[PDB]
Amino acid sequence: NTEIFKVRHDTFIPALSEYLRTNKTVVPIKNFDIIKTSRGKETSPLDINWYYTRAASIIRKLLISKAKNEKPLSIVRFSSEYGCAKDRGNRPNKHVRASKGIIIKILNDLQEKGWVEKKENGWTLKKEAEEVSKQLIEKLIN
Amino acid sequence: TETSGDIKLFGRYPYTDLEVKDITLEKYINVASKVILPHTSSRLNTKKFGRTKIPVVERFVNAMMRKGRNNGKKTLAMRIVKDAFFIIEGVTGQNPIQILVDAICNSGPREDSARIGKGGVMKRSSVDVSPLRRINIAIFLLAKGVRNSTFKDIKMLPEIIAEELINAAKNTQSSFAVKKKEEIERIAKSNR
Amino acid sequence: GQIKGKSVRTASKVIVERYFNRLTNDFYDNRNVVIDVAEIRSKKLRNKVSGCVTKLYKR
Amino acid sequence: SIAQVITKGTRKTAISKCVCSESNEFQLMVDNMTLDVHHDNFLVAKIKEIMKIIGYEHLENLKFELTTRGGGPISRAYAIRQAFAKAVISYFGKYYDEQRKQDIKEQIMKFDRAALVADPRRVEPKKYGGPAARAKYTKSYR
Amino acid sequence: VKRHERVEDDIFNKIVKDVKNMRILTRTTLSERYNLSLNISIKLLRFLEENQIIKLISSHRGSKIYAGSKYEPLKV
Amino acid sequence: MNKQMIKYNADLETTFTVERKDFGRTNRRCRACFAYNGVIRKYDLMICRRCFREYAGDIGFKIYD
Amino acid sequence: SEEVYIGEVLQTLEKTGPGGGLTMCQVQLKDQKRTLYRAIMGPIAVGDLVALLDCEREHRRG
Amino acid sequence: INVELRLLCSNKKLLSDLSNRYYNYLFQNSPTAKKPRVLQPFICDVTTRKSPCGQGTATWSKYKMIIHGRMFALQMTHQMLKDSAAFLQNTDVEVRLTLK
RNA sequence: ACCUUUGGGUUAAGUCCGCGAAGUAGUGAGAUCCCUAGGAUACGAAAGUUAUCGACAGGUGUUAAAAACACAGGAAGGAAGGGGCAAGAACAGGUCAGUGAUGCCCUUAGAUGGUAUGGGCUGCACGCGCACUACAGUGGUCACAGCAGAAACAAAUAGAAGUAAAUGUGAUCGAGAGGGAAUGAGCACUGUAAUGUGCACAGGAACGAGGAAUUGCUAGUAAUCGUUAUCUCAUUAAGAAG
Ligand SMILES: [Zn+2]
């Protein structure tokens, strides 16, 4: 069954984030404490653990993609998902992508842990990454 | 989720046993039409008295989409008034709906100033307002009082809505809308 | 303005004098008769003719 | 085969499709989320409104899945409300006696005709010599 | 005079005595009756709602509303 | 024509060749009248807005709406 | 002070004033024999009830 | 066995006549005959100012050319394809074929 | 030489109804297309597409005729909505810098004809016309979701075009933490050439809602918000047309 849809996103993304950090499965980019997520953003994130909320939300994008049986997700797709409206002085605001470097690092970390498999046209889940999510949800709803 | 009963406003408020309490106004104030959320797209504006059949709190949220920058933001208006009803229901202790009804009743001016002179110079005189125009002006004044009050003041906008509406229902000098109703009626009398 | 125009009133007047007994109080009968007898090349016109003819037939 | 009907509902450029089916329990899903999980409350208010003018005993033993594309957040809620409204009447006409269909239809028609008929209203095309459908550019004299 | 960034002991004492018998109270009241800034009206209000001295009655987006000892709702 | 230019490297002794890209008005002259301005370039027409309107009905364009 | 008379509109006659803003109307008072002629400025329907400040001031032109 | 025949044309009356003619031919041979499929018309458009100079109220015109099209998918033997292709000439309609 | 005759009602329209020394046929309007909205009994086994149909002031109510509103049902209701086409007569209205459309005057190897390398059209005391960001809290910032008209997207370890944005939830900031003008040492891209564009770090001007005047707009309209596999286009949109 499509088990992921049974719980609310603003409870799931915070929940997994702790399981990640307590096992260090993803490691921060150099200068994560001062870098911005996009050229469209005004200031760096208010939470020091923003890198882990990215990791938690990336696995959610992949779980729902797997649930709906879509084509595999690309680095471009993820960059447009996290995009925003950039401020340009005296000109209309304009839609701009997220920066790729963060996303590339997360996907390469998850590859080394065996959580994400690279296909010829995108990235895909693996059995361990599915079962972690399954066993979390089964407690979390109860 | 919250209820499986009959239709209540914001799923909270009774929607029954409502009195207008001015026979001059009776036919022109819709408190009949049971709606869960103050939103409808009913296309009555293309009709001769169709804007008098739109429900009361609907007319009241439309009044908020103003000052230019807020045009079209009808969700924002609903968010604002929802909160105001919580403040008012608490403060007053009675269906927010009867506060809104009584605010309208008091805040419409009964006599007005107009040019009458046709075959010469235009000389100002007092004149008597119709039922429909009387309520149109009531909403206008209640809205204008709220907007200008909040502009560069630290207080929250839903709170200012509760301040004005209570006072208006109670016919107190404290209401911007009530004062300006006195002014118009005094000038009308001056030109009588 | 919903005024019928010259050819529509003229054809209406001629048909009631030419075929009077064939006509009735009913729009659909009258529409059938003008569909049957006339050369009129659009339903847009013959809807208007049969409208005027059934407006006359009462009077 | 299991008893089923399908209906379509439209508002502006939003289109929605509802499938309705026999069940041991009343169930309703929109965007794969139940009413107690779905993220927009205007949609939830517009659903529980129509569910109360129809008697609860008429929605018993029945299941719904709503899918939609096009338009925007307010327009899709009304599109969904029509699709839902037409499903119950369609099912009653097909699988019960026709008097109950007529009874339910009188109640919905007394409340809001726009629950069972679609508004033919759409945006008007822009003409030249103005910013929009009717507004003109500013003429000048001296 | 400008607003303040402390709730000193004697302001704290009298606020407890004042919050009873008040009905609905909000961020502004603490900041427009007494001299506190918005950033210290939040912190004090949140504290009293943990102490069971006040009770929260709404918290939708950032708009947040509270009640004191002489509140009483409608009845059916 | 795709013209070519010689250029020297920093040594001012070795030479290489680079190609000039065809861009701007210089090669997009109106096929009816040699004009450089108001040329419609869509659908691989290369005809100016003045010439277009007299020939449009011969080509097969119509004003429906 | 809040003196008031309630009157019932029986007829409307003429669109009147610069720009045609007013309507000449005939009104009968609810608890007196008096019947007046008045100008009123909002939209008005026959059988409306209107609240007057004076029972005497009149628009004789009718 | 199968053939798909695309009749493509920037004139509606011609395409209507030629398709009615070919439909008649199909039903006269009676191989379980059927109507053509009406395709989404291709529409190429240009928008330009009317005046040859800057003077006056700027008035604009939209010209659009419509390429209508109709598809027959059909069952025939190879001889009947080869022989019937004699029908597919001396038309302002352009005619194209697909086969499997 | 000229007039066809008494100027009373109606429509968007001599569009029509009365009456007449007048009466009969036509052009223009109108009717007559095209797009958008509803409709299989047709076609397909894929799940859509197209459709000779549907609305007439027809019904009721308004006491000459012609029209009309206001209700009601209806996907559509008074020219169904929006375009497109569109009399006669005129004007010394604009364009000879669109034209191998053109009369007449002028120049024509030291050219008023071509080409190349550079410079200007982009200069700056100053008066005017039309646009864009603003003057904050119905705001700023951080994250996270999530939806168009439909369907196109090598890679990238700070960063150097792209598949909405307003918007929805939680945090944060607190009344020039709004605003981004002139300017510095850099780091890249397009290009034959930077003078043009992107990026990072600074820097931080006026402006705190506008005198006399003045411009559009009746419903999915005005205003808001993005977006253009639309036009300009090597690179350049704060312009038009959607
Ligand atoms: Zn040309």
Residue B18, token pair as written in the block: 């409502």
Judged by CB atoms closer than 8 Å, whether chains meet at D42 and B42 is answered as no
Query: Nearest to residue B22, comparing CAs of B135, B136, B105?
Result: B105
Instruction: Measure the CA–CA gap between A34 and D76, rounded to whole angstroms.
Output: 41
For residue B3, give the chain D residue with the closest CA.
Answer: D48
Phi-psi bin for H90: left (phi > 0), alpha (psi -120 to 50), beta? left
Residues in a beta bridge with D68:
D16
Instruction: Measure the CA–CA gap between A19 and A49, rounded to whole angstroms.
Output: 13
**DSSP-assigned states of every residue in E4-71:** BS---HHHHHHHHHHHSS--EEEHHHHHHTS-B-HHHHHHHHHHHHHTTSSEEEEEETTEEEEE-TT-
Name the E strands within chain G: 5-16, 22-29, 35-40, 49-52
* Eight-class DSSP state of D75: H
Instruction: Measure the CA–CA gap between C45 and C49, rounded to whole angstroms.
Output: 6
Query: Nearest to residue D43, comparing CAs of D14, D19, D20?
Result: D14
Instruction: Measure the CA–CA gap between D66 and C1, rounded to whole angstroms.
Output: 46
Kindly report the nearest CA distance between residue F26 and chain H, in angstroms. Answer: 22
| Those residues with Cβ within 8 angstroms of residue D6's Cβ, 6 or more apart along the chain or in another chain | D17, D18, D19, D20
Nucleic strand I contact set for D 63-102 (CB, < 7 Å): 69-73, 76
Residue B162, token pair as written in the block: 């509760």
Instruction: Measure the CA–CA gap between E11 and F47, rounded to whole angstroms.
Output: 83
| List of long-range contacts for C29-38, beta carbons under 8 Å, 24+ apart | C30/C54, C30/C57, C38/C11
Instruction: Measure the CA–CA gap between D105 and E37, rounded to whole angstroms.
Output: 58
Instruction: Measure the CA–CA gap between H24 and H26, rounded to whole angstroms.
Output: 5
Residue C4, token pair as written in the block: 């019928």
Contacts of D128 in chain H (CB under 8 A): 58-60
**Angle between the N-to-C axes of helices D73-95 and D41-53, in degrees from 0 to 180, rounded to the nearest 10:** 30
Q: Does B5 touch chain E (CB under 8 A)?
A: no
Query: Nearest to residue D53, comparing CAs of D8, D75, D84, D22?
Result: D84
**Angle between the N-to-C axes of helices D98-111 and D73-95, in degrees from 0 to 180, rounded to the nearest 10:** 160
Instruction: Measure the CA–CA gap between C12 and C52, rounded to whole angstroms.
Output: 7
Cβ neighbourhood burial of A48 (10 Å; 0-12, 13-18, 19+): exposed
Chain H residues with a Cβ under 8 Å from any Cβ in chain F = 10, 44, 46, 48-50, 52, 61-66
C6: nearest nucleotide, CA–C1' criterion: I16
Judged by CB atoms closer than 8 Å, whether chains meet at B5 and D52 is answered as yes
Contacts of B134 in chain G (CB under 8 A): 42
Amino acid C3 reads: I
Instruction: Measure the CA–CA gap between H76 and H22, rounded to whole angstroms.
Output: 14
Nucleic strand I contact set for F 1-40 (CB, < 7 Å): 5, 7, 18-21, 23-25, 28, 30, 32-35, 39-40
Sign, CA torsion B8/B9/B11/B13: negative
Which chains would you list as touching E if contact means 3+ CB atom pairs under 8 Å?
Answer: B
Residue B131, token pair as written in the block: 């039922």
Q: Could you tell me if G28 and G10 are in contact, meaning their C-beta atoms sit under 8 angstroms apart? A: yes
- Write the CA distances from F49 to A61, B150, F24, F31, F61, integer angstroms: 50, 56, 18, 12, 14
A68 touches strand I (CB under 7 A): no
Identify residues after which chain D is interrupted (C–N over 2.5 A).
none
3-state SS of chain A is CCHHHHCCHHHHHHHHHHHHHCCCCCCCCCCCCCCCCCCCCCCCCCCCCHHHHHHHHHHHHHHHHHHCCCCCECHHHHHHHCCEEECCCCCCCEEECCCHHHHHHHHHHHHHCCCEEEECCEEEECHHHHHHHHHHHHHHCC
Q: How far is CA D78 from the centre of its chain?
A: 5
Instruction: Measure the CA–CA gap between B58 and B85, rounded to whole angstroms.
Output: 14
Query: Nearest to residue A52, comparing CAs of A118, A132, A110?
Result: A110
Sign, CA torsion G33/G39/G42/G43: positive
* Residues shown for chain H: 100
Name the E strands within chain B: 111-115, 124-128
Phi-psi bin for A105: left (phi > 0), alpha (psi -120 to 50), beta? alpha
Sign, CA torsion G32/G36/G41/G42: positive
Instruction: Measure the CA–CA gap between B181 and B175, rounded to whole angstroms.
Output: 10
* Eight-class DSSP state of B63: T
Q: Could you tell me if C2 and C51 are in contact, meaning their C-beta atoms sit under 8 angstroms apart? A: no
**Å between CA of C4 and C1' of I27:** 20
Pairing of strands A122-125, A116-119: antiparallel
A112 touches strand I (CB under 7 A): no
Nucleic strand I contact set for B 33-52 (CB, < 7 Å): 41, 43, 45-50
Q: Could you tell me if G20 and G9 are in contact, meaning their C-beta atoms sit under 8 angstroms apart? A: no
Residues in a beta bridge with H95:
H7
**Resolution of this PDB entry, in A?**
10.8
- Characterize D94-122 residue by residue with b for buried, 16 or more Cβ atoms within 10 angstroms of its Cβ, and e for exposed: eeeeeeebeebbeebeebbebbeeeeeee
Tokens 């013209």 map to which residue?
F3
